[PDB]
């Protein structure tokens, strides 16, 4: 069962109800989903080596400033040669899990016909 | 002997004449020079892994196109993950530096009397 509930996407088919407004509530819980593969990776990350797309932040940094970061963060986040995955996509979902006391499924019957 | 004459650069010290000209001339030798280990190569190709170098290829290739070359030649040299020495330099010399097959001297049998 944890093989696939907790790992494919299919997994809201046991808790449906999630959506994308670009964060979360106070008390919910975050999603992130992401994919694999090297050459998909290479594939997608092609935007971000060409010069005319990597000059907008010289452009935004002469009006606006930006977060500051610890300097090894950054550093680790510019080695794109050796990369197995990448971050796709986040949902929302409004509840938390509650992690404890286990369950015990309770099954019913559906009535005969007449 | 040829554990030390024939593989430190200290060889000028026996064929001196090495030179850089980006070549070689015709009927001449040509010379590579290179150096061993895992942290200096880890550290030499330090900018051959971040995308403001690596837009290069893209950019100039609006207006003149490479060599050909298989994929999988390129797809085997991109991986850079376990490597232990880089070539470094070149040179040249001035004449042949022959191995790998006995020479002949084509002669004439002697006029013995009959």
Same mark, same amino acid.
Do not use: I, M, N, Q
């Given at each position: 069962q944890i093989m696939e509930l907790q790992l494919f996407h299919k997994f809201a088919q046991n808790n449906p109800g999630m959506e994308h407004l670009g &964060? @979360? %509530?106070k008390g919910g819980t975050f999603v992130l989903v992401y994919v694999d593969g090297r050459e998909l990776v290479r594939n997608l990350l092609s935007a971000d080596r060409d010069p005319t797309y990597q000059a907008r932040t010289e452009v935004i940094k002469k009006y606006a400033s930006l977060p %500051? &970061? *610890?300097p090894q963060e950054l550093? =680790? *986040?510019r080695e794109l040669l050796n990369r197995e995955d990448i971050v796709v996509g986040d949902f929302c979902l409004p509840y938390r899990f509650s992690s404890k006391t286990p369950t015990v499924s309770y @099954?019913? =019957?559906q009535p005969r016909p007449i």
């Open positions: &964060g @979360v %509530p %500051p &970061g *610890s550093a =680790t *986040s @099954v019913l =019957t």
